[PDB]
Design a protein around this motif. Structure first.
Motif, PDB file in Angstrom:
ATOM      1  N   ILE A  81      -5.944 -18.969   0.155  1.00 48.74           N
ATOM      2  CA  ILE A  81      -4.958 -18.141   0.842  1.00 48.74           C
ATOM      3  C   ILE A  81      -4.395 -17.096  -0.106  1.00 48.74           C
ATOM      4  O   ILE A  81      -4.277 -15.911   0.234  1.00 48.74           O
ATOM      5  CB  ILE A  81      -3.843 -19.016   1.430  1.00 48.74           C
ATOM      6  N   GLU A  82      -4.035 -17.526  -1.313  1.00 53.33           N
ATOM      7  CA  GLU A  82      -3.428 -16.619  -2.277  1.00 53.33           C
ATOM      8  C   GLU A  82      -4.354 -15.458  -2.587  1.00 53.33           C
ATOM      9  O   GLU A  82      -3.943 -14.292  -2.557  1.00 53.33           O
ATOM     10  CB  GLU A  82      -3.087 -17.383  -3.551  1.00 53.33           C
ATOM     11  N   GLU A  83      -5.612 -15.760  -2.893  1.00 49.16           N
ATOM     12  CA  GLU A  83      -6.563 -14.715  -3.235  1.00 49.16           C
ATOM     13  C   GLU A  83      -6.744 -13.753  -2.074  1.00 49.16           C
ATOM     14  O   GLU A  83      -6.786 -12.531  -2.261  1.00 49.16           O
ATOM     15  CB  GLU A  83      -7.893 -15.343  -3.634  1.00 49.16           C
ATOM     16  N   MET A  84      -6.877 -14.288  -0.865  1.00 52.90           N
ATOM     17  CA  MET A  84      -7.140 -13.422   0.273  1.00 52.90           C
ATOM     18  C   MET A  84      -5.972 -12.487   0.534  1.00 52.90           C
ATOM     19  O   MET A  84      -6.168 -11.303   0.828  1.00 52.90           O
ATOM     20  CB  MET A  84      -7.440 -14.254   1.509  1.00 52.90           C
ATOM     21  N   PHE A  85      -4.746 -12.989   0.420  1.00 55.18           N
ATOM     22  CA  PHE A  85      -3.615 -12.109   0.675  1.00 55.18           C
ATOM     23  C   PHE A  85      -3.425 -11.115  -0.457  1.00 55.18           C
ATOM     24  O   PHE A  85      -3.010  -9.976  -0.224  1.00 55.18           O
ATOM     25  CB  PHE A  85      -2.350 -12.917   0.921  1.00 55.18           C
ATOM     26  N   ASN A  86      -3.738 -11.509  -1.687  1.00 56.62           N
ATOM     27  CA  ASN A  86      -3.741 -10.530  -2.762  1.00 56.62           C
ATOM     28  C   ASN A  86      -4.725  -9.411  -2.464  1.00 56.62           C
ATOM     29  O   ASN A  86      -4.416  -8.229  -2.659  1.00 56.62           O
ATOM     30  CB  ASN A  86      -4.083 -11.203  -4.084  1.00 56.62           C
ATOM     31  N   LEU A  87      -5.906  -9.763  -1.966  1.00 58.03           N
ATOM     32  CA  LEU A  87      -6.889  -8.740  -1.639  1.00 58.03           C
ATOM     33  C   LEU A  87      -6.397  -7.840  -0.514  1.00 58.03           C
ATOM     34  O   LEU A  87      -6.581  -6.620  -0.567  1.00 58.03           O
ATOM     35  CB  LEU A  87      -8.213  -9.385  -1.260  1.00 58.03           C
TER      36      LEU A  87
END
Lengths: 97, 132, 48, 264, 48, 96, 48
Positions: free
Chosen positions: G41-47
């Motif tokens: 989740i964290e990576e995707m929202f950072n992207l």
């Protein structure tokens, strides 16, 4: 209640500051005992171990980590010693004549 | 190729070797744009599992260009203080067999024998022969 | 007169609370910690 | 003097060790209200962990420790220092200072600490590579302090036999300081009125290794006595033994075939 | 107790000695009644 | 607290054969020839204690905490030959 | 346990338990799947 204190601290920091908490948990581990006059640490084997909430810590030879002087504590993982330091009393030990 | 198991047989009383100065590696770089990093010495059983994310080691294998040298060094230093193995020292000499240990760390303690390890890591120690 | 067992000694670093007890021929009664009831564990709350 | 006459409380101050970023007081020194000796014994009776030098500064300071096993390491360090001092005194090469001896006194009736402090003043000959090759030295001290009860309590020993009486004294007194015949000539009058010209040292001369470089032995052929191979009931002996790895000290097969380039 | 002190040290160990004392204090009068009354009964039954 | 301590002491005197006083030692072997050790146990011990309690009192108070103390007896309080010691992981140490 | 009752299976079969344990030697670490989800989740929202 150092057991409680440390447990909640560590459970809250478990993901905000992953890098620091990880390096800390694998270098020191959240328990340590003295052996002869010197003190060593019993680190954690598995990468993530949810530290137990209550524990028979203060009575007997099993000290809680995260509260040693050991400036290495500050060096390895800041933002953790930068908390533990804010807690030690550092007033006096005035006797009572 | 296969059975590169060479009976390295490190000794239990020297597993604090961990803090080695960035355990020797082997860099290479060709037009395949790979970033291959072979691991020299007793460290060919370590597998960067789905842990170690956001460590430097991951974020460098996206650097498209040629890889600088000092990066390898300091990133390895930043990695070595995260990696760990189970062991226990006791009276006498013992070898470590360096295989079940690396494995039960290679997979983070999910197969039955790992339970025999994480709960009691003396069985990893063994005398002259038959570590199994 | 009441307060004689000190509660702490400063640093939360090498404290190790008191460890006296009575021995009565095998049986042992500690003084700082005994899981016998009638010693209500205190429910303190940060909310103060 | 003015201070004490004006306040009349014992004065306690700490010592926070090196590596500034540490603040825990590893121990605490404590000054006495009455620089006489009687007060020293008095204050030493209480304060369940205490020690003091023999230097005149005794009259002005006692020590107070934190634990039971924090004493041991300080006593052993002071003992190593007293070894160095006895040596450098032997050749009259005493530095621009004082403090005839470095050892300590205490009233802890602990079997272990008393064993150490009793066996110590008989091993004031060897040099113990203080902190330059720091090592099992202290562990070896504790072991050899233990490996005498198997000798001074049982018969069949190298006690020869009077060391019994001397060692029993040293172990049973706690008050006298036992000085070898040399140091006593310097410890004059102004300390513990409890001392003795000890002598008859135990004969154990141990060697000291050099820096990390290894050691070589030159097993001899001349002798006067022999030692036994396997117990006097049996023929052939077999020492089925372990082996070393290769990640330890390696194996070079490179045969040096040339000195300077001419030899090519 | 030695078992606790091996694997789980982060746990408390007061209740164990607590109920050690309890068990002994509770086994005293039982064994009293056992060796004081049943013994004769078993002799009789053994001669039945 | 001195009152409760003296109560416990005097009661400890007439039981627990393994203790004397510096002196007579014989009229004790005249007194305690009625208890017939070791038929005595808790049920009896508590009766002794409470019966002693209910015969004190001529101006001294010893009631409320004393009530609470005659109250707590669920831990097998037998108490023959007490000795204060230290405790390291429930391993009694000898007297240094 | 499947084959040891002579059920029908290809000799030396296997399976893929999609999840992990929570009782590794009786200590209860923090359910790694939570981490594998959280970092995702964290990576995707950072992207985004």
């Amino acid at each position: 209640m150092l057991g409680q204190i440390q447990a909640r601290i560590l459970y809250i920091s478990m993901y905000a500051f992953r890098q620091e908490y990880l390096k800390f948990i694998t270098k020191f581990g959240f328990y340590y005992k003295i052996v002869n006059g010197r003190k060593e640490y019993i680190q954690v084997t598995n990468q993530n171990e949810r530290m137990t909430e209550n524990n028979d810590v203060l009575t007997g030879n099993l000290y809680p980590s995260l509260f040693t002087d050991d400036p290495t504590l500050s060096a390895i993982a800041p933002t953790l010693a930068k908390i533990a330091r804010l807690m030690k009393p550092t007033t006096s030990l005035t006797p009572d004549d | 190729m296969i059975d590169l198991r060479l009976e390295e047989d490190i000794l239990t009383a020297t597993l604090p070797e961990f803090l080695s100065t960035r355990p020797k590696y082997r860099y290479a770089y060709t037009n395949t744009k790979q970033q291959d990093i072979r691991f020299q010495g007793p460290m060919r059983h370590v597998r960067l599992t789905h842990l170690y994310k956001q460590t430097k080691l991951w974020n460098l294998q996206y650097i498209e260009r040629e890889l600088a040298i000092s990066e390898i060094d300091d990133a390895l230093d930043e990695f070595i203080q995260t990696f760990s193995l189970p062991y226990v020292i006791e009276q006498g000499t013992y070898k470590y067999n360096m295989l079940l240990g690396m494995h039960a760390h290679n997979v983070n303690y999910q197969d039955d024998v790992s339970e025999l390890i994480a709960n009691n890591p003396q069985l990893l120690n063994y005398l002259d022969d038959n570590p199994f | 007169m009441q307060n004689f067992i000190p509660n702490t000694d400063g640093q939360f670093h090498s404290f190790r609370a008191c460890s006296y007890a009575v021995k009565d021929g095998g049986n042992i009664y500690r003084v700082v910690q005994n899981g016998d009831e009638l010693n209500e564990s205190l429910l303190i709350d940060t909310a103060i | 003097s003015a201070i004490f006459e004006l306040v009349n409380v014992d004065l306690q101050i700490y010592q926070y060790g090196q590596n500034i970023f540490n603040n825990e007081a590893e121990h605490t020194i404590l000054f006495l209200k009455d620089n006489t000796n009687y007060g020293v014994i008095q204050a030493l009776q209480k304060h369940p962990f205490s020690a003091t030098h023999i230097n005149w500064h005794l009259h002005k300071h006692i020590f107070v420790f934190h634990s039971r096993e924090q004493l041991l390491n300080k006593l052993l360090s002071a003992g190593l220092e007293d070894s160095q001092l006895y040596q450098r005194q032997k050749t009259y090469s005493t530095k621009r200072g004082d403090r005839p001896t470095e050892r300590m006194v205490t009233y802890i009736e602990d079997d272990h600490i008393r064993r150490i402090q009793a066996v110590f003043p008989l091993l004031l000959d060897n040099i113990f590579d203080v902190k330059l090759h720091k090592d099992s030295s202290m562990t070896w001290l504790k072991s050899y302090a233990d490996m005498i009860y198997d000798s001074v309590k049982n018969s069949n020993s190298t006690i020869t036999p009077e060391i019994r009486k001397l060692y029993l004294r040293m172990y049973n007194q706690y008050m006298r300081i036992f000085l070898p015949i040399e140091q006593y000539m310097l410890y004059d009058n102004t300390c513990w009125p409890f001392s003795e010209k000890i002598t008859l040292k135990i004969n154990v001369r141990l060697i000291s290794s050099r820096e990390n470089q290894p050691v070589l032995w030159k097993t001899p052929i001349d002798t006067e006595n022999l030692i036994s191979i396997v117990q006097p009931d049996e023929p052939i002996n077999k020492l089925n033994f372990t082996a070393i790895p290769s990640t330890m000290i390696r194996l070079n097969d490179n045969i040096t075939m040339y000195r300077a380039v001419k030899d090519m | 107790l030695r078992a606790f002190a091996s694997s789980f040290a982060q746990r408390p160990r007061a209740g164990v000695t607590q109920l050690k004392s309890l068990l002994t204090q509770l086994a005293d009068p039982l064994c009293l009644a056992l060796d004081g009354h049943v013994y004769h009964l078993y002799n009789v039954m053994a001669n039945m | 607290i001195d009152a409760i301590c003296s109560v416990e002491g005097i009661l400890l005197l007439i039981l627990s054969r393994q203790t004397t006083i510096p002196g007579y030692e014989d009229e004790l072997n005249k007194l305690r020839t009625g208890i017939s050790q070791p038929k005595v146990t808790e049920r009896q011990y508590r009766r002794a204690r409470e019966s002693i309690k209910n015969m004190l009192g001529s101006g001294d108070y010893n009631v409320a905490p004393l009530h609470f103390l005659l109250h707590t007896e669920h831990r097998s309080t037998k108490l023959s030959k007490p000795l204060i010691r230290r405790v390291l992981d429930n391993v009694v140490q000898p007297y240094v | 346990r499947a084959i040891a009752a002579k059920f029908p299976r290809f000799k030396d079969s296997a399976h893929l338990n999609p999840y992990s344990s929570l009782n590794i030697g009786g200590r209860t670490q923090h359910s790694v799947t939570y981490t594998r989800m959280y970092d995702a989740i964290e990576e995707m929202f950072n992207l985004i």
